[PDB]
């Protein structure tokens, strides 16, 4: 049972390591998408204001 507990703790430690790595990869990919999203939003805002201003 003692070596069983040691194996259980080691398995938890390695699994949490892997989970953290995967979470950080998801975070970087999602931020990389966030950048283009907010950039397009800014362009829409500026274009919508300026095209309305131009014609009138």
């Amino acid at each position: 049972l003692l070596d069983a507990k040691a194996s259980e703790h080691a398995a938890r430690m390695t699994a949490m390591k892997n989970a953290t790595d995967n979470a950080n990869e998801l975070i970087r990919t999602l931020t990389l998408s966030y950048n283009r999203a907010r950039q397009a939003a800014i362009t829409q805002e500026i274009t919508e204001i300026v095209a309305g201003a131009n014609a009138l």
Partner: protein, 56 residues
Amino acid sequence: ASLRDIKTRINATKKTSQITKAMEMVSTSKLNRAEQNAKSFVPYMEKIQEVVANVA
């Protein structure tokens, strides 16, 4: 999708990464303490297995 969806997903991933890292940091101490507990019984096991191996 929208900045709302992207930031919500990023926040969920952030929270999950926090939880996983906390679990890992908990598990490291458990591994070390399990090892130093397993170190304790070794002479007792050696003694009993010595006696049984003698009588074997």
